[PDB]
Curated annotation (Swiss-Prot), chains A, B:
The protein's name: Two-component response regulator ARR1
Cellular component GO terms held in the UniProt record: cytosol; nucleus
Every Response regulatory domain range: 8-123
One BP term from GO: regulation of root meristem growth
Domain of life: Eukaryota
The species this protein was found in: Arabidopsis thaliana (Mouse-ear cress)
Induction: Down-regulated by gibberellin.
Keywords per UniProt: Activator, Cytokinin signaling pathway, DNA-binding, Nucleus, Phosphoprotein, Transcription, Transcription regulation, Two-component regulatory system
Residue numbers carrying 4-aspartylphosphate: D59
Complex formation: Binds the target DNA as a monomer. Interacts with histidine-containing phosphotransfer proteins.
DNA-binding region: 131-181
Residues of the full protein shown: 31 to 295 of 690
Protein family (similarity comment): Belongs to the ARR family. Type-B subfamily.
Length: 187, 187
């Protein structure tokens, strides 16, 4: 089966053991890895080179910033795939990862198969217009709406009815659902 | 005539004399001023609190980043009003300020009237949808198109014809033109 070697991953964690594990497993899986232990530094590294990182993995806890708001900055503001690394697997923490913008999550202890499969949010087998940026408030309304209808039955028109946001289009919701589908199915 | 006192301005300059002048004049004009001497730090200060700064003034030259790309980060990526502070007033530098995302510019020496009038890009006398973010490449095509048609005659349909970007709408161009109208008229 197909495997995309050489994707570039930024791993953000103030825990050196967690960082070492993630880096070693990603290199075993042929990803290219950049490590960083501060949220502010991660954000600077991502702006420094847009079209430089394919996916970010960041710890739910960070020493210089609330970890969930880093998820918002990376996953929503910058529209990058961000994966939440958490030691806590309660329903509330897992729900908060996706409500703050992550496309997926990893629970300690991280299994190789789970870690290796993160490329699914980046590549697929088969000058452009302005990109649309979702606010955290809008995103949380979307997650609530989709969870109410059921992820398998939620169609753009029904999501829109529940969100009740003038100007929000069917296309906007469909492309947002495609980005967050995998996480929402895990719920 | 109406004057909006108390707007919050971030001034970004590694030249302490320039920073002191801008801060003193802005405080005389009743703005609230935050100073910062590094591009990276400016960017962190702006994310730290969105809905915190009303307008940014940044020097065309910065020691830790190309000044024009800071304009892109602030004016286009973050969609804040950024004003280019420059000692150079050549046609090429002035054109580059607006092609990299600034809504206006200030030339040394800065006159009080010019400095005091920066509120025009922020306020006016009379949960929402995703915001649209322009890439620098798209923005530069837009500036070229508008300059070809003439800023006073440029209507969205004609701008679109010249830009030739599938998916770019009339509404997108009209709201972009409204943001950059003042600078483009100065050209």
């Amino acid at each position: 089966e197909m495997f995309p070697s050489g994707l570039r991953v930024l791993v953000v964690d103030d825990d050196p053991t967690c960082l070492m594990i993630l880096e070693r497993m990603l290199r075993t899986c042929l990803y290219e890895v950049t490590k960083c232990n501060r949220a502010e530094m991660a954000l600077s590294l991502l702006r420094k080179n847009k079209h430089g990182f394919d996916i970010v993995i960041s710890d739910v806890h960070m020493p210089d910033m609330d970890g969930f708001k880093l998820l918002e900055h990376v996953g929503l503001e910058m529209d990058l795939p961000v994966i939440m690394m958490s030691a806590d697997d309660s329903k509330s923490v897992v729900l908060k990862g996706v409500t703050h913008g992550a496309v997926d999550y990893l629970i300690k202890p991280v299994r190789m198969e789970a870690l290796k499969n993160i490329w699914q949010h980046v590549v697929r087998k088969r000058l452009k217009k302005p990109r649309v940026v979702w606010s955290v408030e809008l995103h949380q309304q979307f997650v609530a709406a989709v969870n109410q209808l059921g992820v398998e039955k939620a169609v753009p028109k029904k999501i829109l009815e529940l969100m009740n946001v003038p100007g929000l289009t069917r296309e906007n919701v469909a492309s947002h659902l495609q980005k967050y589908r995998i996480y929402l199915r895990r719920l």
